[model samples]
Target: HSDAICIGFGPAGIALACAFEDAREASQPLGDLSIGYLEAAPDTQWHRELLLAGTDINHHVFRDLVTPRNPRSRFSFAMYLKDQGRMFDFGLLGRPASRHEWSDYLGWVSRQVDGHTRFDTPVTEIDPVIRNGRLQEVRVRTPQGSFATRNLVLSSGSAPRIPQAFEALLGPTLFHTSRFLTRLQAFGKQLPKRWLVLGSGQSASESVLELVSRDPAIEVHSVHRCAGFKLTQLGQFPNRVFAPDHVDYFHSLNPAARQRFLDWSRSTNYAGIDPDERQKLFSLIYEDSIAGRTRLHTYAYSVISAIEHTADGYRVELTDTFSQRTRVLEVDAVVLGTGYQQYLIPPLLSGLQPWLAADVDGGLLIDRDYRVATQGACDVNIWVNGLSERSHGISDSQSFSLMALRAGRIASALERAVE
Candidate 1:
């Protein structure tokens, strides 16, 4: 049996596996760990479609895969840039690289660990292999067969949370922001003349800008529950919420205080737009207004009540929260930038339900080190690389934030357990 089986090859999986290897190469106590990664994608592409033009990474360059914990690691972003002979040019830019560059860096790192990962191999289920009322191993199932591992890392990432109002309305005509580029590109010449882009967050603003800027003929309607675009809180002091040590401080707070902290910091990452993006969108809307030709419509304090398919396209019913008035708009397509839901435990984990513990909010009780707490019957180390946001703090949900540090913590924990 292997020391660990990583279920997804996204940022988290890559960081953890590579960190384990780094520790191994250094002759650290955990160097002997045999980690294998399994990924569903045919290749290493993180949000391939969302790597839009003119969009830079949200986090700093130092927050790359391995730098925060292992500054000298070969897989660091600096190493990638230096190896590519772009270090001088990149330093002159004086800003974080584009998301496209970030993707390329991740792909390069994936190549370094390529020999240990199995692509296009999805893990369908993870069940605990129990013997004598104690967990022995984890039985992982794929299309080919099942393999057993001493530990399992659930880093499959998250799925786009489809709003209930548009649950049955999801398909070609209607989709989420996650599938924005793929769906739009496939539509090609049959692109919609009128489009409804829902939500007020980064994706919504980005979608609005993308649609109106590319096609002048396309009429775009931007709808959101908030009155206007909220600026993301990224000031020097306020930004400490994403720091490594801040996670411990946030986690130490009681449930009520944690809820308060979240409410105070919601705008930092949730339903907020970067200042530059906001300025671009604002300019587009105001310029159109001044010319007396308004193609971008912003509907604030409004929510989509219902969506019905019509003969031509979709009939979207939007309701104003204050006035309580409903307006119907006929649009060729609809895009929901409603965000995602974490703590997604697959139904296949039902067998281990009794062993799992839940917090007051009924979410999984994740330990400080990102491992899920289980009963005595379950001794296997079951860790979540992405879905521990609620317990581990905000950094758990983002890329390039606490990735390497978390991986280092996991490695240290595993080493301690071995002793």
Candidate 2:
């Protein structure tokens, strides 16, 4: 039996694998543990669907898979650049690494640590293994096979957040940005001309840009809860929350206090555009004004109130949150860049509820080491690699800032747990 099985071999999982690999090479106690990974994708492809051209990673390259924890580690992005023979050129390039390059770097590391992974294995359910009236291990059931492990690290990433109105409307013409590339390819030459891209976040903005960029004649309607596309919080002082020290500082606060902190930090992490992107979008709108072309439209102070299907297209009604005024748009396609959500008790862990120790907010009670706190004599350890943002703060979720450092922490904790 494997010592542990990590779900999703994406960046978060890759970082941990790197930590385990380093430990083994260093002859550390953690090296003795036998851990394998189950990845849903055919192979490691970090946001492959959205690996758009000219798009770069938002974070610094220093916060790579290994550098934040062990700069000397062989899997560092610097090493990747050196291996790819681009170190000298990259140094002079002077910009955040491209999303394409970063994705390739992740794949390169995954290839180096390939033995421990079983690709195309999607976990459908996690069956709790109970014995002697206490939880022992878990049987992770999948189409491929059932993997038994006393410990599991869930790094499958966030579930796509679909608005309640769009639940029944998901299909070829309507889809989330996560499925953008795949859907567009199947959509054929008659790509939807009149489009509605929901949300003001990066994905939504990217979706809008991609549509218009693909065809100059394409008309796009962008909907936002507030004024359209605000610049992301780029100041280093506000971004300091991503540092390891901030985790403890944010984590120590009461649940209510933590929520208030998360709300204020939203500008830094969510629904905001980069300064450059913001400029480009504003310029696009400005330049088009002279041409008498209203190619890009932004709905301010709005929320989607209703949606209905038509014979050739779809009709969406947007209502101003404050004014209570509504406007309807009929579009050929819709992209819900509405973002993602984490269930307090992920449906996968629903079967293990009796063993889980939840917090006041019904979220998992995760320890400082990232292990899920369980009740009673349960010896099994469940670690949330990137899904504990509500409890751990902004840096722990959908972020690369603290990944290498967090991987180091989880590795040490797992070593101690198995001791």
Candidate 3:
């Protein structure tokens, strides 16, 4: 009958709560689970700008919400579509939905689970107390005050992984793709004509499309290390990475083997382009050229060595990947589609660092079940979804299937412990 709190209502947290429900339903002696879900935004809509930027998702609608974890769960993407009465139309689209649609579906899921959730509360820190050799209290921050819970789960979303070298290069002149649109908003009607976009990931390609589509006069200088555009295969073989079974397989591997798998299969998840978006980027590059706009430049297999601010705009130095020769390009703005690292185990956990074991990578060491291991005999469960990559592999952070499956496992574990 003790209280529990989950930080972050994203995919991972949602999955965990769903799993908790299943555990309760299965007649698994789950204790009176007074679960509290906390979110930082004033409401769900405030996060829209940050999370719902690009149109479609890399994952299909069926892979959405709780579908990847439990098809029978009411939170399944199919259920969301069915509820929206777009089930037939969704099937007609015959492919994965746009990222916006997926984000919307997630919001819908949030509403469905409204009673158990709390909005506008961001967990600022975790203060653990060991009472008589038992891990007892967890302190979570909200707008009003910190709330204590018997068990805690950290499912907070990922933060932008901007490079330290380009710190000076950022401002109105520079932006990562994640915030390119927002940064662009800071500008008035008039804007610089040319932009330099770095990286070759899906986001990079999408940003290129966004830039050209949004501003007809905005020329793009895309710097990449690859020779030419390499499409990230999102078909069955590749897309199957998000299949439910993949979660089990990924979690079962040894560390070395998992790292090897990640190294070999890195392109699939890390920086691959969405097939539809890639087509749009390629078409834009061609159409712009044919139309004589000449606003797109693809510097594939290149690297941005250094970047600095200029009186008017900014200056960027690059090295051609093939030639290993250096070159400089000056532009009004820069967009880096530099990918993300880990999503979970936020900087807020810094205070608890000494109490928990720090792995070689310096992140809190988590067990196979995703609990944050502490110093003493007492156990305080701190489950994470996107934070396990360093210990598990690429699948830990990126896979939707893994998110669901892991959440379910943690829920089952909680069911046992709490009961």
Candidate 4:
């Protein structure tokens, strides 16, 4: 078991561990086994902490908790709620649980598996110990030291992509939505009287909601580079994209076809803002106009060209996407809910890039089962959740689907290998 470990503690990581559990259960009639998980962060997970505490999940509760890949399992959101003695109350709340509530449920499930998690241990690098021609070991470095694992499951989430324009703008003033709620709370209502919110994604809309909800007097400027904001297709057929079967179909596609699906589905996660959040922001904008206060401003085909810190607030440069005209405005602070980039494993994979599959387009090429296929004489299985949009299509790192089943598949693979 010294060389069998996993990195990251999000769903992909934990679900994979749960899959390892499934693998064990399926094979337990034979003998005992061992599996391990390592979380890069200091704590197990802070899913709710990352989001504004009040944020609601965009998908259904059944999508999470444990993983629906196995219905009989007890780790589901439904089971978690039932065990918490609030399943009835939860049902009373109706529909899916809030994103924060789901976070709480996950925390509860985390308590069930006592020592499956190794906290404060960050996996620094993965060295392929390929003896002869097979992957003999995967050496992972932590703050403590280095250890080898038989296999690796990389669920290191995603990276926030602040447009190049925001680099100079970032400082004590501007902030990305990753820390939207925290930073805003620290700045409080005193600062950011005139807030500039960028991007057309749900996070952007959520930021706007957090900003306006915190203070009605605050002026919020909505800037989008797209022609117009599009709503996420979370209804019916669109929701079907997250179904288990869709994941299998998605993983089975060729690299080029997968990339096409990703291009077509990118809007689902990046640009697609929740309809309710969008409507709420729109309502605020409409109300502000009715009140004869130009507090809310919406620009469709434009984006923030630059942001420079000023004495009181900051100077933001906006460019018209169509007209090619730029405008400047001195605002309190710039909130870029822009989006994120997909890297299979950053920092760690930087040294191992030579062995990885070539960057397909701007993303990496992943295999059918979310494994990072190597081009060399390597045998270790390096898998990822957020790094395979180009290869696994839009479902890569998506919260809507893929997690539970993928976990089971990888766990099953690992177990079978050991067997």
Candidate 3, 1-419: lDDT as tens digits:
14677887766776677766655666555525778788776455546546555323555555554565678887787778778899888878766776677667767776666567777676666776667855556677666677776677777756666889886666766877767766777886776788888876666777788778887898889877664445444422335454434535766876667767767765444444567777777787778788788888778668888877878777888888778888888898888777665733467676555566666556666666777776653545666655445655543334445667777767777666564
Model 1 segments more than 4 A misplaced: 44-56, 230-240, 256-270, 284-292, 344-348, 387-389, 393-396
Candidate 2 vs candidate 4, lDDT winner: 2
Better of 1 and 3 by lDDT: 1
Question: lDDT score, residue 353, model 4?
Answer: 60
Candidate 3 lDDT trough over 10 residues, lowest sum: 231-240
- Per-model lDDT: 0.74, 0.77, 0.67, 0.64
**For model 4, what is the error of residue 87's alpha carbon versus the real structure, in angstroms, after optimal superposition?**
2.1
Q: Which stretches of candidate 3 lie over 4 Å from their true place?
A: 21-31, 52-60, 132-135, 231-238, 242-270, 343-345, 395-400
TM-score order of candidates, top first: 2, 1, 3, 4
Question: lDDT by residue for model 2 over 1-419, one digit each (tens)?
Answer: 78888887777888889999998999988888999899877863635424332232556788777997998889998899999999999989887776668778877888898689898888999998888999998999999889898888888766788878898999999999888888888978878789999886667766777787787789999998877775343223213344556678877898899888888886455433445556666687678779888898888889988889899799899999999999889999999987778668778898999989979777688866778889864668888886345876653344554668778888887777786
Q: Work out the TM-score per prediction.
A: 0.90, 0.91, 0.86, 0.85
Expressed as tens digits, the lDDT of each residue in 1-419 for candidate 4 is 44356777765666666655554556652124465677766553454356323233556666763456777666777677777799788778755666667667656656665367787787767666667665556678778777776666677766678677667667656878877756766865475578888876667777777777777677788887665554433333324454445656877777678767776776544434445566677787778778786676778879766666767778878889889998888787888776666654466766556566675553355665666767663456666654344554452344534567677666666655554
Q: Candidates 1 and 2: which is better by TM-score?
A: 2
Each prediction's total of clashing residue pairs, residues at least 3 apart in sequence or on different chains, is 1, 0, 11, 6
Q: Which number leads on TM-score? A: 2
lDDT of 1 by residue, 231-346 (tens): 34322221244455676787789988988887777645443345667778779878887877789887888998888898999988999999999999999999988777665454
| TM-score of structure candidate 2 | 0.91
Error of 4 at 241 (Å): 2.7
Better of 3 and 4 by lDDT: 3
